[PDB]
Amino acid sequence: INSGTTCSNDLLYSNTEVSTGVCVNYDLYGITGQGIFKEVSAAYYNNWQNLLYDSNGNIIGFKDFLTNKTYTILPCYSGRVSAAFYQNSSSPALLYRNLKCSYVLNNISFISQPFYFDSYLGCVLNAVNLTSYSVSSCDLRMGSGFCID
Amino acid sequence: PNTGVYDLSGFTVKPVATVYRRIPNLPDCDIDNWLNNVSVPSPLNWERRIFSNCNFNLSTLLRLVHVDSFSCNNLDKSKIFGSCFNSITVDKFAIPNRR
Amino acid sequence: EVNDLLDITQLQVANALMQGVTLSSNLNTNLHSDVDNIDFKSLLGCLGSQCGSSSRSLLEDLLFNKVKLSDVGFVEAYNNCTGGSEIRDLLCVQSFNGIKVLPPILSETQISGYTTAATVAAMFPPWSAAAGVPFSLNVQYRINGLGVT
Amino acid sequence: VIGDFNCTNSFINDYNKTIPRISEDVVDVSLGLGTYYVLNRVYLNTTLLFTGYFPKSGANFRDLALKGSKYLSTLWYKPPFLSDFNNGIFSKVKNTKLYVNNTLYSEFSTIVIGSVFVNTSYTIVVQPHNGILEITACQYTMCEYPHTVCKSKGSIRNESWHIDSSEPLCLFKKNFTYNVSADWLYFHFYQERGVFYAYYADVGMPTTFLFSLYLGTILSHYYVMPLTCKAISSNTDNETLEYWVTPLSRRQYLLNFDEHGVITNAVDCSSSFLSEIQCKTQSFA
Amino acid sequence: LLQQLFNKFGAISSSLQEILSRLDPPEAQVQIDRLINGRLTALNAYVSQQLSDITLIKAGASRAIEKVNECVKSQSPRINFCGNGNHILSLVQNAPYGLL
Amino acid sequence: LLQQLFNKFGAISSSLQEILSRLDPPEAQVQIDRLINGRLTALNAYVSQQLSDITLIKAGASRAIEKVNECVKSQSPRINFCGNGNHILSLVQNAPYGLL
Numbered sequence: 001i002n003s004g005t006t007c008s009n010d011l012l013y014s015n016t017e018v019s020t021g022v023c024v025n026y027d028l029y030g031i032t033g034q035g036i037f038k039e040v041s042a043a044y045y046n047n048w049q050n051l052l053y054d055s056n057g058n059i060i061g062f063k064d065f066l067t068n069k070t071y072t073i074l075p076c077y078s079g080r081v082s083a084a085f086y087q088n089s090s091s092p093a094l095l096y097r098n099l100k101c102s103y104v105l106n107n108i109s110f111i112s113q114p115f116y117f118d119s120y121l122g123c124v125l126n127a128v129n130l131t132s133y134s135v136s137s138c139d140l141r142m143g144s145g146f147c148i149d
Numbered sequence: 150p151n152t153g154v155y156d157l158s159g160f161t162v163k164p165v166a167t168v169y170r171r172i173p174n175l176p177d178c179d180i181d182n183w184l185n186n187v188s189v190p191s192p193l194n195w196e197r198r199i200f201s202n203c204n205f206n207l208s209t210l211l212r213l214v215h216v217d218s219f220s221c222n223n224l225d226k227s228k229i230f231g232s233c234f235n236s237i238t239v240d241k242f243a244i245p246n247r248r
Numbered sequence: 249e250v251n252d253l254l255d256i257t258q259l260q261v262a263n264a265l266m267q268g269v270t271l272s273s274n275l276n277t278n279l280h281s282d283v284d285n286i287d288f289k290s291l292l293g294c295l296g297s298q299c300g301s302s303s304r305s306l307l308e309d310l311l312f313n314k315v316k317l318s319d320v321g322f323v324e325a326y327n328n329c330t331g332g333s334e335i336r337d338l339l340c341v342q343s344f345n346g347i348k349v350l351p352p353i354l355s356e357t358q359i360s361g362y363t364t365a366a367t368v369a370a371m372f373p374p375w376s377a378a379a380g381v382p383f384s385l386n387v388q389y390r391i392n393g394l395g396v397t
Numbered sequence: 398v399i400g401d402f403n404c405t406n407s408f409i410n411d412y413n414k415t416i417p418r419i420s421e422d423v424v425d426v427s428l429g430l431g432t433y434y435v436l437n438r439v440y441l442n443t444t445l446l447f448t449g450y451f452p453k454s455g456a457n458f459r460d461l462a463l464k465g466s467k468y469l470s471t472l473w474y475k476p477p478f479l480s481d482f483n484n485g486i487f488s489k490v491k492n493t494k495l496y497v498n499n500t501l502y503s504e505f506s507t508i509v510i511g512s513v514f515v516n517t518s519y520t521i522v523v524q525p526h527n528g529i530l531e532i533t534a535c536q537y538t539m540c541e542y543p544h545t546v547c548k549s550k551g552s553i554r555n556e557s558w559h560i561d562s563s564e565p566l567c568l569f570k571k572n573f574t575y576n577v578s579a580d581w582l583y584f585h586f587y588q589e590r591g592v593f594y595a596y597y598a599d600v601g602m603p604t605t606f607l608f609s610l611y612l613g614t615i616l617s618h619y620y621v622m623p624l625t626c627k628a629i630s631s632n633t634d635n636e637t638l639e640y641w642v643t644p645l646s647r648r649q650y651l652l653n654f655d656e657h658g659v660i661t662n663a664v665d666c667s668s669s670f671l672s673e674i675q676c677k678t679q680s681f682a
Numbered sequence: 683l684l685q686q687l688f689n690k691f692g693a694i695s696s697s698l699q700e701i702l703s704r705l706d707p708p709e710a711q712v713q714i715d716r717l718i719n720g721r722l723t724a725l726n727a728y729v730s731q732q733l734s735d736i737t738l739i740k741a742g743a744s745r746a747i748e749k750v751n752e753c754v755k756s757q758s759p760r761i762n763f764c765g766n767g768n769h770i771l772s773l774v775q776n777a778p779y780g781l782l
Numbered sequence: 783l784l785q786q787l788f789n790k791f792g793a794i795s796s797s798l799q800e801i802l803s804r805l806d807p808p809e810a811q812v813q814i815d816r817l818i819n820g821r822l823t824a825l826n827a828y829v830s831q832q833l834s835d836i837t838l839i840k841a842g843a844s845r846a847i848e849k850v851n852e853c854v855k856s857q858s859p860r861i862n863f864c865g866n867g868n869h870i871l872s873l874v875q876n877a878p879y880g881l882l
């Protein structure tokens with residue numbers, strides 16, 4: 001026992017769990033990572049290739065040799081928030097840069113925020129849309145000619 | 150704190166599950182292609198085969214042959230499912246009813 | 249600190265283009281694009297009282313179309329990162345490992361307006377950027393000062 | 398000498414001592430021949446500056462094919478023929494063809510790669526079986542004169558490179574299929590970081606991945622195993638066994654992948670000055 | 683800078699997940715320390731290069747301010763400052779990361 | 783910079799008295815070398831930042847010298863150099879690390 005080759009292959013499943021659209025771990029044929037899968041048809045694999053690469057060295061697609069089905073892999077979202085905080089307040093204002101507010105209220109934060117809008121810079125939470133007004137000096141400069149007052 | 154704009158880290162994504170694939174080296178054993186053999190030997194001249202250097206599991210086995218019991222001894226029934234042994238030596242024969 | 253210095257030099261260049269220029273409230277660049285049979289249409293964005301200040305000139309458009317990753321190209325590059333939208337770009341893999349590019353505090357349409365006013369300040373009453381005299385008179389006096397009668 | 402466990406004792410004719418030849422063909426890697434696809438990966442419309450174990454541009458071969466009629470020298474098991482596996486070998490193997498009632502029989506020699514070739518350490522044997530190529534990485538118990546036999550119209554001797562009828566510890570066992578009517582077969586074998594890598598192709602092209610095998614040790618020797626057949630020579634239908642090998646080296650190549658993923662061009666980055674310019678700018682022009 | 687996340691720097695791998703899933707935590711720190719030191723070395727080199735580029739950018743920004751003030755907004759009795767001499771006048775335009 | 787003397791940098795301690803009174807001279811070298819490397823990296827980073835700050839200080843010193851020469855000791859036919867343009871005159875005064 002516990003030294004050799006006649007191994008029991010069960011406590012190491014290999015199911016059809018290629019669940020697209022979400023972020024998941026992967027251990028594909030030796031290579032480890034996390035990513036987002038998406039089903040596709042591919043025309044370039046031969047009978048000895050199961051991973052797709054680029055010249056930088058990133059793994060960008062694969063082919064499950066259990067189902068003969070091809071998929072593409074995307075990186076999972078990582079980022080920061082920009083908090084515009086005025087003194088003696090109780091909570092800052094939040095900018096998720098380059099993100100739609102549907103993506104923010106669905107996939108990032110489920111916490112109660114009654115105020116949000118989709119600005120040119122991203123998604124603004126805890127602030128009113130008042131771009132018709134204008135100001136000549138601002139402490140909280142957000143970029144591209146916008147400001148928080 | 151003072152007035153300012155700060156770059157605060159948010160927790161962003163957590164991975165849901167695992168995927169796995171390894172395209173195995175050795176060939177399966179097919180114990181159940183031997184345990185469902187036609188010519189069953191009698192308790193005088195029982196057979197024995199030594200299934201070694203292959204891959205196996207238990208669930209396809211014990212549902213592909215019509216089990217009525219599976220005890221163990223010096224073992225725990227879930228310690229099969231993980232480990233890697235060195236050989237397996239299945240010895241079968243038929244049963245006379247009153248003995 | 250480097251990004252603070254960049255903001256300071258941006259505000260200084262924007263300050264020098266507007267330091268002491270006075271314009272007429274009855275100007276309209278749709279009507280007054282030239283003087284003295286010298287054509288200034290390709291140098292001027294828009295201005296007046298009925299235009300809408302989001303406009304560059306012809307030369308500025310001809311230069312910004314040949315350069316992709318401007319301040320606006322970076323924003324619309326990073327907007328496409330949720331999903332890749334083809335499969336992949338280098339900037340989304342860079343931003344998901346912590347390397348982003350921020351927009352500057354003044355948009356480039358604002359600096360387009362500041363160069364529009366530096367252009368129009370030399371062509372009309374009160375000729376602030378021309379030392380008080382009209383434009384072709386100024387050219388005449390400048391050529392006169394080289395040894396021309 | 399190969400293995401200590403003695404198997405045979407007859408027909409130990411000892412006087413013949415022929416040497417491996419030297420070919421009249423430099424290996425030319427301009428059209429992919431000499432290179433391989435990167436394990437199990439795909440690359441589309443790109444140039445890849447890849448560092449791996451390749452042959453050297455402008456080098457020559459050594460034929461290691463040995464055909465006995467009935468006799469077996471002990472100088473056929475000597476460091477004239479038992480060579481070393483430093484980094485690897487690129488191999489060009491001739492596919493001999495025999496005909497019995499106009500039926501095609503392919504044949505060439507097998508190959509063993511190991512360290513000390515006993516039943517306490519792992520050796521790798523690649524063996525043809527007439528259109529089927531069986532690879533076994535195990536703990537064999539090697540014979541004193543390991544040799545093989547042909548199977549179409551066989552020899553007088555019995556194929557005996559091991560007598561180990563116990564199914565020993567194998568780390569790898571697999572089967573592959575190739576063209577029986579092919580002219581040559583190309584093979585890459587190398588090792589790095591305690592892992593063995595193997596590649597093959599049958600049509601002249603870059604070689605395709607066979608398998609990787611994690612061992613942990615360092616192989617040090619290899620041997621082309623001598624064959625013994627009935628009638629192959631020039632009095633017959635003019636068959637001749639060949640097995641050419643060239644060593645491998647850790648060097649840098651530039652590969653060109655088209656939009657379907659076929660290696661169209663390769664450049665050895667130290668052949669000339671233009672190749673150094675081509676590889677440091679990562680472009681063919 | 684992004685290609686520095688694929689060097690090993692003398693470790694067994696460049697992946698943190700491979701090291702934390704194949705070694706034991708007294709022996710994993712010896713490998714993660716090499717990756718940490720190599721990546722912090724890379725970031726220090728990038729930061730020094732940015733600190734040296736900003737000084738050239740500031741010198742160019744100050745001369746552009748000066749040409750705005752004394753060739754466009756007014757005209758100056760310098761010779762060979764704007765243009766080449768026989769210079770008459772000068773206009774300005776907005777450009778990506780600068781001024782034409 | 784003074785707070786870099788309390789970092790461990792991978793060693794067992796940040797004190798040298800603790801490493802030298804708890805380990806053996808073959809074993810304490812492995813721990814003293816890590817402190818040496820971390821502290822010399824800290825010093826190299828500080829020296830790079832000082833060498834880059836000196837160039838901005840010298841650019842400010844040159845513009846202050848020039849404003850003394852052509853707005854204070856005399857008056858120049860430049861427009862929009864000192865003041866705003868409609869500039870009449872300029873005085874100078876001494877300031878901590880500079881000039882008002």
Ligand SMILES: *[C@@H]1O[C@H](CO)[C@@H](O[C@@H]2O[C@H](CO)[C@@H](O[C@H]3O[C@H](CO[C@H]4O[C@H](CO)[C@@H](O)[C@H](O[C@H]5O[C@H](CO)[C@@H](O)[C@H](O)[C@@H]5O)[C@@H]4O)[C@@H](O)[C@H](O[C@H]4O[C@H](CO)[C@@H](O)[C@H](O)[C@@H]4O)[C@@H]3O)[C@H](O)[C@H]2NC(C)=O)[C@H](O)[C@H]1NC(C)=O
Pocket residue numbers: 401402515516538
């Ligand atoms: C893993 O590999 C190892 C190899 O490294 C395997 O080990 C080998 O196992 C062989 C058994 O199959 C064994 O072969 C011979 O061993 C017998 C024991 O020999 C001793 O006892 C004899 C008592 O009669 C004695 O005479 C003999 O002395 C002889 O040899 C020495 C040199 O070793 C001379 O100096 C003497 O003068 C004398 O000549 C030994 O002391 C031996 O009896 C067997 O020979 C008889 O049987 C043969 C076949 O029937 C027959 O041909 C022969 O004439 C004899 O009648 C037998 O051949 C190897 O010695 C042994 N090698 C080592 C290094 O241990 C191991 O089995 C393998 N493991 C597995 C699981 O496969």
Ligand SMILES: *[C@@H]1O[C@H](CO)[C@@H](O[C@@H]2O[C@H](CO)[C@@H](O)[C@H](O)[C@H]2NC(C)=O)[C@H](O)[C@H]1NC(C)=O
Pocket residue numbers: 009010066177205206207208209
């Ligand atoms: C138990 O092991 C059996 C081994 O047969 C597994 O079934 C095999 O799955 C692979 C993957 O497609 C097929 O190539 C084989 O043909 C299957 N075997 C047979 C007999 O058809 C099975 O998936 C395992 N199940 C569990 C729960 O471990």
Ligand SMILES: *[C@@H]1O[C@H](CO)[C@@H](O[C@@H]2O[C@H](CO)[C@@H](O)[C@H](O)[C@H]2NC(C)=O)[C@H](O)[C@H]1NC(C)=O
Pocket residue numbers: 047066067068
């Ligand atoms: C996926 O495609 C492969 C082809 O590469 C299929 O493998 C073939 O399977 C049939 C019957 O199982 C064999 O007769 C062929 O010889 C196989 N071809 C090769 C190249 O091995 C495989 O069956 C396919 N799998 C699925 C689920 O469709």
Ligand SMILES: *[C@@H]1O[C@H](CO)[C@@H](O[C@@H]2O[C@H](CO)[C@@H](O)[C@H](O)[C@H]2NC(C)=O)[C@H](O)[C@H]1NC(C)=O
Pocket residue numbers: 182183186187188
């Ligand atoms: C059941 O076991 C017997 C072994 O007793 C297998 O019998 C073999 O059958 C082949 C048929 O071609 C014969 O050539 C062998 O000689 C037989 N073996 C022996 C030892 O006699 C039989 O194949 C097994 N059944 C299955 C389905 O595998």
Ligand SMILES: *[C@@H]1O[C@H](CO)[C@@H](O[C@@H]2O[C@H](CO)[C@@H](O)[C@H](O)[C@H]2NC(C)=O)[C@H](O)[C@H]1NC(C)=O
Pocket residue numbers: 176526529531570571572
């Ligand atoms: C690979 O193919 C060979 C045949 O080319 C198989 O060897 C046969 O195995 C069966 C059962 O063990 C024997 O009855 C035959 O006599 C063998 N033939 C020869 C020529 O040796 C081998 O089993 C196959 N192995 C795998 C892993 O597929």
Ligand SMILES: *[C@@H]1O[C@H](CO)[C@@H](O)[C@H](O)[C@H]1NC(C)=O
Pocket residue numbers: 087088
């Ligand atoms: C506002 O902040 C200042 C901090 O300087 C604090 O002293 C003061 O009490 C605050 N005012 C209120 C109403 O909390």
Ligand SMILES: *[C@@H]1O[C@H](CO)[C@@H](O)[C@H](O)[C@H]1NC(C)=O
Pocket residue numbers: 021022023106107
């Ligand atoms: C975001 O959440 C929705 C459900 O609220 C889900 O359908 C979608 O897959 C999620 N997107 C990502 C990228 O996880």
Ligand SMILES: *[C@@H]1O[C@H](CO)[C@@H](O)[C@H](O)[C@H]1NC(C)=O
Pocket residue numbers: 117118119129130131132
């Ligand atoms: C924000 O306000 C402006 C003007 O008030 C309006 O045009 C724009 O559509 C608004 N956007 C959102 C997301 O509310």
Ligand SMILES: *[C@@H]1O[C@H](CO)[C@@H](O)[C@H](O)[C@H]1NC(C)=O
Pocket residue numbers: 284285
């Ligand atoms: C002279 O003035 C008229 C109207 O004031 C104008 O249309 C014309 O272009 C001017 N010509 C010159 C040479 O200045």
Ligand SMILES: *[C@@H]1O[C@H](CO)[C@@H](O)[C@H](O)[C@H]1NC(C)=O
Pocket residue numbers: 321324325328333334
């Ligand atoms: C962003 O995605 C849209 C939709 O696919 C596309 O039309 C646009 O060209 C993309 N922009 C960039 C900069 O990639």
Ligand SMILES: *[C@@H]1O[C@H](CO)[C@@H](O)[C@H](O)[C@H]1NC(C)=O
Pocket residue numbers: 403404406
């Ligand atoms: C090898 O074994 C055979 C019989 O097994 C025996 O006749 C022969 O003498 C042996 N040779 C040596 C060198 O032991």
Ligand SMILES: *[C@@H]1O[C@H](CO)[C@@H](O)[C@H](O)[C@H]1NC(C)=O
Pocket residue numbers: 412413414415
């Ligand atoms: C035997 O060896 C000699 C010299 O080593 C060689 O000339 C001869 O060809 C060999 N015999 C055969 C049959 O090849």
Ligand SMILES: *[C@@H]1O[C@H](CO)[C@@H](O)[C@H](O)[C@H]1NC(C)=O
Pocket residue numbers: 442443656
């Ligand atoms: C070939 O590679 C070039 C390199 O950018 C790419 O533009 C082109 O689309 C590729 N060809 C195909 C058919 O995709």
Ligand SMILES: *[C@@H]1O[C@H](CO)[C@@H](O)[C@H](O)[C@H]1NC(C)=O
Pocket residue numbers: 497498500
């Ligand atoms: C060829 O034919 C002869 C007689 O017709 C027969 O003895 C021999 O076995 C055949 N060879 C093969 C490979 O079938």
Ligand SMILES: *[C@@H]1O[C@H](CO)[C@@H](O)[C@H](O)[C@H]1NC(C)=O
Pocket residue numbers: 553554555
């Ligand atoms: C080869 O084996 C056969 C039977 O397996 C036997 O008759 C023959 O004598 C053997 N030949 C030699 C040289 O051992």
Ligand SMILES: *[C@@H]1O[C@H](CO)[C@@H](O)[C@H](O)[C@H]1NC(C)=O
Pocket residue numbers: 576578579580
């Ligand atoms: C390789 O095999 C294919 C089909 O199996 C055949 O058409 C082709 O002729 C073979 N190659 C050679 C060189 O005979």
